[PDB]
Amino acid sequence: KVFGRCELAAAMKRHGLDNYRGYSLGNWVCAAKFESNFNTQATNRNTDGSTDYGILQINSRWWCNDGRTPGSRNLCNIPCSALLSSDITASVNCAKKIVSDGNGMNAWVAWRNRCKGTDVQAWIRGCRL
Ligand SMILES: [Cl-]
């Protein structure tokens, strides 16, 4: 599924991401835009044999198990295939674990480079929430 901006904002708000661990909702919407272009089936392979999965590009070395990544830790305790659903629940629940691990939203490279330091509340402007 490809989400619309406000459609995704509403879904993320229902799942408790607004202000979660100090990160306002616009951070999460901006991260999804630049990580996956709002596509729940986005996948990207890395040089270490890991793959990033889904709307928040969750990595298979640390967080989900895809059965083909050396050194897998599976800290979200979820198959990576569940993160390619059109329903974002599994992705959101794993993202909550990632942001609590320690280093905030710095796990998301596209967030660090393209969202952090900008007015991210613009990403939810005009949405009914
Ligand atoms: Cl899998």
From Swiss-Prot:
SUPFAM superfamilies found in the cross-reference section: Lysozyme-like
Subcellular locations according to the entry: Secreted
Any one GO molecular function term: lysozyme activity
Catalytic residues (positions): E35, D52
Tissue expression profile of the protein: In the egg white and polymorphonuclear leukocytes.
Protein family according to the UniProt entry: Belongs to the glycosyl hydrolase 22 family.
Remaining remarks: Lysozyme C is capable of both hydrolysis and transglycosylation; it also shows a slight esterase activity. It acts rapidly on both peptide-substituted and unsubstituted peptidoglycan, and slowly on chitin oligosaccharides.
Protein's recorded name: Lysozyme C
Source organism of the structure: Gallus gallus (Chicken)
Lineage: Eukaryota, Metazoa, Chordata, Craniata, Vertebrata
Protein encoded by which gene: LYZ
